[PDB]
């Protein structure tokens, strides 16, 4: 009653910019929820509103949805899908089982989208030729992130890469980082045929290409979103779909509690220390 008629002031300890719900309508970054559905933006359209607070063009919205379908699942053998299945088989709920596998995502699992985007942009911004970038990273003892597949090499391409690369060439107005990464790929396939752009490295160089070449973002704004981890969220939101599907699969199959076999574990305990 004292705050409403203005005798006191109390500092607001929180600041938000992505959603306003204290009104007649739900608002996604300045846009009402009816105008969200009237203008036929999809899940990639509201992802641009919630994560970037921007009206993205319809190719940029549809590219975001295509990134979520190719990162949706990659089988149960990966480290995150393993942990979801163990937590599902231990009788836990959907939220706990998702979480136990979603927290495996980080640097060695699921970090190659953000790592390759930072890697190729650093080489392209500090302008060096793709031949010098391959030689620079060889002498530092580091492999190029987003380069190299286990089985699909050349004349047998990765189909997830070929779906997304065909979309980016047709619809994006300019792809300078993609063209840089494809010349890096031309050099690395002269060493081994397997060293092609992954689906991790394709998404990384084309999401950066979507940010700084769609007109919605400035250069310092597009570099900030890569720096704070927008491509970490693209993998996490995509792979959360397959992890929930891995949870719902183990509940249907009614799999019991898992115990790892003792013969797969090497016990190298000390003598009496």
């Amino acid at each position: 009653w004292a705050r409403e008629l203005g005798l006191i002031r109390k500092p607001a300890s929180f600041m938000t910019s992505i959603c306003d719900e204290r009104g007649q309508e739900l608002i996604y970054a300045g846009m009402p929820i009816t105008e969200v559905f009237k203008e036929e933006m999809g899940i990639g359209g509201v992802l641009g509103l919630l994560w970037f607070q921007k009206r993205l063009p319809k190719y940029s919205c549809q590219f975001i949805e295509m990134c979520l379908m190719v990162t949706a699942d990659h089988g149960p053998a990966v480290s995150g899908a393993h942990n979801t299945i163990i937590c599902a088989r231990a009788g836990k709920d959907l939220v706990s089982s998702l979480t136990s596998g979603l927290l495996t995502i980080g640097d060695r699992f699921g970090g190659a989208l953000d790592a390759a985007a930072k890697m190729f942009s650093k080489a392209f911004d500090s302008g060096i030729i793709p031949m010098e970038f391959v030689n620079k990273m060889k002498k530092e003892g580091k492999l190029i992130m987003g380069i190299g597949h286990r089985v699909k090499s050349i004349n047998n391409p990765d189909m997830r890469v070929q779906i997304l690369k065909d979309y980016v060439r047709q619809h994006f107005p300019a792809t300078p980082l993609l063209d840089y990464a494809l010349e890096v790929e031309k050099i690395t396939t002269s060493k081994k045929p397997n060293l092609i752009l992954n689906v991790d490295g394709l998404i990384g160089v084309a999401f950066v290409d979507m940010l700084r070449n769609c007109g919605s973002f400035t250069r310092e704004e597009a570099d900030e979103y890569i720096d704070i981890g927008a491509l970490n969220g693209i993998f996490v939101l995509g792979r959360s779909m397959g992890f929930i599907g891995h949870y719902l699969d183990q509940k249907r199959l009614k799999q019991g509690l898992y115990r790892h076999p003792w013969d797969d574990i090497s016990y190298v305990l000390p003598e009496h220390m």
């Binding site: 203005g6 002031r9 500092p11 607001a12 600041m15």
Partner: protein
């Protein structure tokens, strides 16, 4: 080469340090003095990154930018002519000689008490060369009612 009118109703200041209560006292002074703009345009704290600190323009919440480096504050705010130096006695000498490298600053307020007299004479000598008024050291600053007050001068509202 010292000026006569040090402060006016368009005077902008950069405050060196985290004195959020002191800066809020200035913005409480400005709104009651019916100023158009706050006195404090930026704050300089060398121990944190560049961000924005939330303050009050009366009942309205505004953001004042905080800068790690002084050069980022002087470049982004060319209209600032006053520095209010809230550095300690062992750090006010290096902050005041660094802000005399910027010609926009015409008045420096040094709040710290305990600066050695040999170091203060070098502050007086270089301010005499650059034509820069120094109010201090060991002062609360000063107050010009209706226009501008320095830091904590005059107490609370």
């Amino acid at each position: 080469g010292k000026s006569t009118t040090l402060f006016s109703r368009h005077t902008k200041a950069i405050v060196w340090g985290m004195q959020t209560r002191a800066v809020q006292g200035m913005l409480d002074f400005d709104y009651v003095c019916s100023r158009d703009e706050p006195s404090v345009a930026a704050m300089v704290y060398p121990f944190t990154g560049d961000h924005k600190q939330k303050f009050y323009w009366g009942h309205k919440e505004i953001l004042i930018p905080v800068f790690k480096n002084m050069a980022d504050a002087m470049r982004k705010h060319p209209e600032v002519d006053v520095l209010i130096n809230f550095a300690s006695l062992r750090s006010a000498y290096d902050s005041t000689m660094e802000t005399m490298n910027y010609a926009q600053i015409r008045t420096i307020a040094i709040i710290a008490q305990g600066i050695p007299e040999a170091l203060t004479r070098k502050l007086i000598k270089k301010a005499d060369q650059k034509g820069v008024t120094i109010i201090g050291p060991a002062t609360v600053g000063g107050i010009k009612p209706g226009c501008f007050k320095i830091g904590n001068t005059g107490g609370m509202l």
